[PDB]
Amino acid sequence: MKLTEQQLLRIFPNARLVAGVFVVALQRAMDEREIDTPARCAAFLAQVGHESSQLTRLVENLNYSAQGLAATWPGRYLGPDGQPNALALRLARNPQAIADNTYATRNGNGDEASGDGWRFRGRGLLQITGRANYRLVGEALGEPLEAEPWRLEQPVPAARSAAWWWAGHGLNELADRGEFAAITRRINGGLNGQAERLALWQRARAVLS
Amino acid sequence: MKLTEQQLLRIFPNARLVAGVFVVALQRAMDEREIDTPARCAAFLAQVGHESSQLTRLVENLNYSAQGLAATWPGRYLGPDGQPNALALRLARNPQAIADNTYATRNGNGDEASGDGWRFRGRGLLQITGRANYRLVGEALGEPLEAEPWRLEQPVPAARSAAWWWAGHGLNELADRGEFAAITRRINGGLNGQAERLALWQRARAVLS
């Protein structure tokens, strides 16, 4: 394989500003994890491109309204009334407080007071969340992700972390067989955004063919 | 008073990469705090110019060697053999750990495990350090500096925080009287870097005359 910046802009047009640095980051991460054929690369690029809004969103958005908190984490933020409860009202529209509360004690995070929920909110192309996962990924990649979680918003850690996760979940062999929807299920635990993933995938297959 | 980009670049030649994004910030901050004459403005720009390396260094550098630790905080990191002690060896060349230890429980910071020391390390033109000071200044500027301390590395909060501190410590009236060395003592508690402060001062006086 070989990916050209021309090919990137045709697949991720909204990455014009980042495509220059991402092209080397992606090419190297893809070689590193044997994402090494048009079929493997098209599937990989289609999935990470959906999950990262074409390389423009590498950090999770926690700007929820009180109604959004109640819809998203109802066991936490929905009252017996069908209305946002008092906790939802207290945290509404405050991303740091939302993450610090919602993700406390999740995936190796400390408690609310630790600030771990915000500190280790989702980052990357295929997003990594929680202290223990930043630790695990940082150690697999030889980068200081637990100490510097913001590194996952930068091209090389984002690309290498996504390629590592991809190859480690058997997604290369799924791509070999053309089982794209089965890849979507493994990444999403469902088929949310499948229509969008499929359109990116068919673009990428045409470009990389 | 009016301050032009070309004037700023004549006072701060090394500001060439940021002058365009600092000129309005500085003009507005100076107006806001009555830094409103050539003499007040020349003194202010000379001091913030020295303290920020002509607007090129808006966050403190904590990349110390074990020897630098011992030399900079001899009381904390220097040993009786004139050698860095064991704590200094532990922390050497790790800025996060250095800040977390050296500044813990300083200026409202928590302990070394809180991470306050690094989180609220020095930022701005006249540098602000420590949780309680970020909260003090954020509240006085109406900016969310305690929640987002990195904002003090941006032009408007850096300039406004420096103008607020300047006017709040009587330095406008000292500038009125030409008492430049008195200003240095209030900022530095000594006369360190006075040669460079005076050089910038006389330059600023000529440009703004």
Author numbering:
A (entry chain A), B (entry chain B): 1 to 209
Sentences copied from the publication:
Finally, the crystal structure of PaGH19Lys was determined and solved to 1.8 Å resolution. The PaGH19Lys structure displayed a fold consisting of α-helixes. The helices are packed to form a structure with two subdomains, the large subdomain (Met1-Leu55, Pro155-Ser209) and the small subdomain (Thr56-Gln154). The protein contains a deep-spanning catalytic cleft with an active site comprised of amino acids H50, E51, E60, Y103, Q127, T129, I187, N188, and R197. Among these, E51 and E60 aligned structurally with the catalytic base and acid glutamates in the structurally and biochemically characterized GH19 chitinases, suggesting similar roles in PaGH19Lys. Based on the structural comparison of PaGH19Lys with the well-characterized GH19 endolysin SPN1S, , the amino acids E60 and E51 were identified as the putative catalytic acid and base, respectively. Some lytic activity could be observed for the E60Q variant at 1 μM, but it was still significantly lower than that of the wild-type protein. These data support the idea that E60 is important for catalysis by PaGH19Lys. Comparison of the structures of PaGH19Lys and the SPN1S endolysin revealed substantial similarities, particularly in the active sites, suggesting that they have similar functions. The topology of the endolysin active-site cleft may reflect adaptation to accommodate the peptide stems of the PG.
